[PDB]
Write a protein that binds this DNA or RNA. Sequence first.
DNA 1: GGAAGTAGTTACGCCTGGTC
DNA 2: AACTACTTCC
RNA 3: GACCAGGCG
Lengths: 65, 48, 1098
Amino acid sequence: MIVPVRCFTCGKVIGDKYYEFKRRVEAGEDPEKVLDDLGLERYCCRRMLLSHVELIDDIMHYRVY
Amino acid sequence: VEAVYRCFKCGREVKLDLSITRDLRCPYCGSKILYKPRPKVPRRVKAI
Amino acid sequence: DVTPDDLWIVMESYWQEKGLVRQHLDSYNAFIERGLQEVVNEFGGIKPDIPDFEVKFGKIRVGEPEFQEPHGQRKPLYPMDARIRNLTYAAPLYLEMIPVIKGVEQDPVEVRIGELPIMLKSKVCRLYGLSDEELIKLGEDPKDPGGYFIINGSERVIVSIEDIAPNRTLVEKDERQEKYIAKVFSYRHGYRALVAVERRKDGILYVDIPNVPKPVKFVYVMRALGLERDKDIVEAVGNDPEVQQIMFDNLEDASDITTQQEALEFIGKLVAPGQAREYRLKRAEYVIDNNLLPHMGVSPEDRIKKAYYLGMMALKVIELSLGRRPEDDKDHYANKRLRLAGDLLKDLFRVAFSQLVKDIQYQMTKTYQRKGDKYTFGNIHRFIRNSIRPDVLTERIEHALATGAWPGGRTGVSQLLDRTNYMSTLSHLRRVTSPLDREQPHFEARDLHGTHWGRICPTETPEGPNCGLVKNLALMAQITTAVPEEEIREYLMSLGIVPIEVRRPDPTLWRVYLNGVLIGTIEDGKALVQRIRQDRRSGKISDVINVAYYEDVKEVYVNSDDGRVRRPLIIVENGVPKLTKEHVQAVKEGRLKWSDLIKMGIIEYLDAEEEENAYVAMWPWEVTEEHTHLELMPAAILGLPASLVPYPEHNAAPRNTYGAGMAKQSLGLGWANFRIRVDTRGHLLHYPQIPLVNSRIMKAVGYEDRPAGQNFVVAVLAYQGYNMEDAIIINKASIERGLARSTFFRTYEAEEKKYLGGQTDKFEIPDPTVRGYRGEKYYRNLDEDGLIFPESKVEGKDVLVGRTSPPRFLERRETSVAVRPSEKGVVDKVIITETGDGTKLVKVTVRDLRIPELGDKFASRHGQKGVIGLIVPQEDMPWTESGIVPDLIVNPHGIPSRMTVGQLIEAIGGKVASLKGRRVDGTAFIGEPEEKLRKELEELGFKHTGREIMYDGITGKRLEADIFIGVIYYQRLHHMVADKIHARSRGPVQVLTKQPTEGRAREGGLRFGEMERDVLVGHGAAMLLIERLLEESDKTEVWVCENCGHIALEDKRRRRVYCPVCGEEERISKVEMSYAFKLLLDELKAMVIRPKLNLSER
DNA sequence: GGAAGTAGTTACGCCTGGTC
DNA sequence: AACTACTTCC
RNA sequence: GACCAGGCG
Ligand SMILES: [Zn+2]
Ligand SMILES: [Zn+2]
Ligand SMILES: [Zn+2]
């Protein structure tokens, strides 16, 4: 849905890094280099950013009022 | 009894009484479906 | 040559142009475009009992989806409103009537004959051809593929039925009487006829007709069908000398007894027993014209063609007798045609239209007789309009769709659509079922056939009774829609085929069969087949046409029917495939589409018959001059849930089946529309994730936009014996951070029902003076209107819609709606609306947060099911030298017995994907090899085996062995322990048997069956058996008259006990027995049986 | 002795929903 | 359906 | 209450 605030495994905060990672990867930079620059060294943290889906945009359209 | 109701297609509020009004419809877009709105009261939620 | 990675582009284009539900949409669009008018053309004009009046039928027209308000008019209706207000998403159906007054036709009148339910996303629905934003504005998920119906607010999907090919004769051996049996299922206007011929052990030929109670000698039927001459019969059946002799022997004993004119009478004796000779003749000719080979026709002119077809069937059974041909396989897909939504709707509409036609005839006759001819001919339009009564057809169709019981013996045709997630819905929309009974051991029908390759998924099938009988389509499968047969017949005849009337079949002449019926004869049948396929590739012949030949028996089969499962292949000619690199580039750049490639003759569609003639290669480097086709993508032979599994060829087949079946039960964002959707139950994983090791097919289909599951860090070690026996150990810190979190939705419904006489019920908070009043605490959250405020915490047995009904006790009774006794949550949404009839309707949705706990079921894509055996704090979990803590631990003892190497390869691939920052391709046969993954893991700085040095959290020292750890995509299934736990101390009982009710929803009791009774007996526990089966179910006391043995009567008014049968008052004593046994005594005293009871002193 | 007919069975729970 | 076992006409 | 369908071991 929306990017998790913390890594499920070790609790490192990765909420802010997702949008930077997405824009840098779309810019054409190497994903490994981007993830290293962001500070995610453990592959548990890299799993959180690499496998996340922004589903909030696709469901914001329907309101419950 | 006048009750606050919210339309389905449009989000703007509609006022009527179910017991009296035989026909329920938003008198602006003709929508038969309405939402009972959330009361403006505090709700305590445990963050766990 | 072309890389398989380049054929992937073409396959992706195939899935892009045509969705995953194209079979339903194609069949239903064909039904609407031509099927309805075809049915109405079968149903000739209504002729009533009027002197000079009858009505012809014009053109069927279906309008836009609209709903007639009870007090308003036909407003436009959209699917969301249809599925929220509990309506049926249907459209008006209009039929023109042509009145024929004394042989002349007046101006037409358009009358509505009923409503026809509309399948979503079809060419008549309001969602057709709408952009994503337009569908979103209508409160719909643009990812939804349609292909289903909405009937009374519920989504119904019609599952295709794997029937036997119609009008095709199959030969097989009885193996009991040494009788060769050849049967055909002739279809005409929705009616099937099982015409079979039989060569018994005596060498005589017998024919079976469904409505003829006894078999009849074949020559008798042949002569009854207009074949006067014996030599003509012998020539027509066959020209081979051995067959000629067999027919001569079979015909001498027939001609010596029954001639041409005698055969009809002989059949009439069995069909219509009695002395009425004219009635016997009428019944015999009726069962000949209608009940024997109906597909040939019902007119006497079609009798002769029936004779030719019967002769061909006899020739086939004789050839089987001589062993010149093998037995016909019934599981071979050349012999099975699917029945889709279009044809099933056609049959159902035919039945409903027959009902409507008969009803209108009755109404017309009655109204004419009961008001003469004053206005029937003065104004015929009103006479027709008032006699319509259109509700019959719509009620019949809607009832059939809602219950699923089709006309005839078919049941379960329409099933409730599964909306657990994306995979479940799409797989349900791509499902195939067999009509065979699930109880019987259909060993030949429950096994995988070689013809299933590319047509049916080899691994996705349910466990248990339905195994093998319920099948799902392969991703490359395409199901045909029929083309007009007459044009195909004319083209084939123009190709050089001469009809059998002019030229008779000969051993050196090819027998050509179109659509399973023999049409003519040609020489050099291979040339005809080559010309046919060359014409099809050139584009002048439609795609649906398929042709095959058989050198063994010199037969050319041409198929143009509907319901054939086909697969696409690349045409290979002279060792060079037709597809080239420039075609792939054009497809990639969007200049070329899949239909274009099919039209140019680059890619071909083959069913089982044509594939029999093929020699298919599997890889481009395997192509030789002898190959006829090349496989577009061998990984597309799997189903969709089966394609979810990564590295499926490194797993055992049972585990692949388990994983494919469990992929349809996972939790995730199945549809973005869930918030405003009203559904009985639903789930929502709070943080779905893309599988790090995933197939490219999953991205092409769209599973990535609706993922269901998460990537876990999995360590394979034994930990405190709490993951023993397929149990799973999980991390508490991971759960508390959102791992596998989910929310459960339930939607309760309350309707303000309007009873007869104006006695309505009311939405209100009931006063305590009403009967059946619950506690005043249960109405705590209710509003004065009578509805619970949203976002108000609701626990078990709290009411949501306070409701009171008119009294019917022998004050107003209470019928309010409360949550189920074992369910809690928060009121997410309360909507109010109006029903179809006009009564008020309210839907209340309650959401319950389900944090994982002990007992919740988790599964991986490789079939490793398990429940949480323990929830361990993070400080107790082991950790790796790289700082990696598992989110989940699995016992190694579950790996080797199951032989799921694919799970280990997926763990390696997931670790490599996380380290690289690029997801790993795990496609079925072109995915990244395990050797490459191990080498890459080695180069990334980790051990190539995937084992890592781990430390014990409890004691702090490193484990002796290097622990295998990786990233595996685990999914949480909807089998939560909160939805299954049940306990009943004491509660309601059934009225009939006084035993506890059945079901978790109604405080039911657990059935202590007879198997448990034998278990208790084998232990010697006699008093425990008494306590479990007598005290705790239905213990009662009865009065028995010792003199007679009947049951004595106790008069509570007179305070006396006596036996009415004999009038005894002193020899009466109590006995103790289960109420079920007293009921049994009652049912035995019924049907006149006397169960006299003898009593003993204890 | 056939040679057909006829009848009698075909695991145990459990859960969900939907329609009568 | 697919097995058995009778039954029962032959 | 009994019918159907889908699952679970
Ligand atoms: Zn981490
Ligand atoms: Zn409105
Ligand atoms: Zn007595």
